[PDB]
């Protein structure tokens, strides 16, 4: 039987919660007796966003609506869903192919904690949250609720819920500070650089098993770049709510996980429209997408040398620009160092 924390080990029940993948597989039509949680693939998924590629380009110089079934159809052989015995839908708008990238970005994060849950060795005389937590390569410890990191913290979420997002409020449940393998090493070039911020990271809960273990990635070389804002970058906000949407949590599953990272943003390409960017421009570490609404650059206070950008949100100044709020991308995954964890209650008015 365990010796971690209640809360630590709350958070491994539902990290590893191999019905909760089930379900986000079933939330993507994938048809799960066709497409078994056991026979998910990298092979697979890359070559899905292969072929989610081919319709990138037939979509952006306007093929014929039959030119396109061919290759909608082809992606449905290879990713099978469950449509019975009718056609399974067109995918001949960009806004459907994004929508199945979302699906490979999530499926790729869903291989890997199954991965590590059939890997390894098993032993009836052991806890199961003892033996998924050392699969983490993650050390997870409870942060004191009278402690000054928590105070910083918590007005960080109370600051920084934006009026947009309003259908719902956050409740902190609990905060952990946590330390991956190997991270801190990897981070030691950005140690010291300037323009280092705390920026928040929200993911569906059926994602951190892959996070905590291999880090918040970039995608995948397969996977088309006109699907995302600012490119194949790891994107990070300094509202709580913005990221908090990313949880996807909703009334029957109010409870969400967000984080908490370093960012090495340094001279950030500011930018206020989408550019499916490759490389950065020379003496550029870090994009940042102009908001119309900032944190108070005022209200800026340090934790550990870290700035944390808690201000209250007011106008930027900035016009034309296609954001309501904040955006930070980096393309390197030495440049993010992850700090916090917290489990949220979502408390929908909806
Ligand atoms: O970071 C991102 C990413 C996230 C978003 C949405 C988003 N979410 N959350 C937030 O807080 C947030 C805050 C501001 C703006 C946007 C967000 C938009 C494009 C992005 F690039 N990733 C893409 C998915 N993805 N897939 C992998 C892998 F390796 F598994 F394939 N790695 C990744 C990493």
Known sequence: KSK?????????????????????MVEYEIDLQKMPLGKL????????????????QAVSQGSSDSQ??????????????????????????????????????????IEVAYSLLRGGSDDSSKDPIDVNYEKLKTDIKVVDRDSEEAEIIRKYVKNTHATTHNAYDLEVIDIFKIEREGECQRYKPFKQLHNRRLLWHGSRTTNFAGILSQGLRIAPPEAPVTGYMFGKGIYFADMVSKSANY???????????????????????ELKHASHISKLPKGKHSVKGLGKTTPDPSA?????????????????GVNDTSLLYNEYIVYDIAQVNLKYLLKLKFNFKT
């Open 247 to 269: 949880c996807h949590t909703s009334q029957g599953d109010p409870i969400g996980l967000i984080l908490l990272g370093e960012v090495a943003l340094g001279n950030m390409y």
């Open 300 to 316: 800026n206070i340090s934790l550990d040398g870290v700035d944390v950008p808690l201000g209250t949100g007011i106008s930027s």
């Open 68 to 109: 396109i079934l061919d290759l909608s159809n082809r992606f449905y052989t290879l990713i099978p869903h469950d449509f019975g015995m009718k056609k399974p839908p067109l995918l001949n708008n960009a806004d459907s192919v994004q929508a199945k990238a979302e699906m490979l970005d999530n499926l790729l994060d």
């Open 4 to 24: 971690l924390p209640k809360p630590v080990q709350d958070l491994i029940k539902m990290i590893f919660d191999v019905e909760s993948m089930k379900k986000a």
């Open 41 to 56: 693939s990298k092979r697979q998924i890359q070559a899905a966003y292969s072929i989610l590629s081919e319709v990138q």
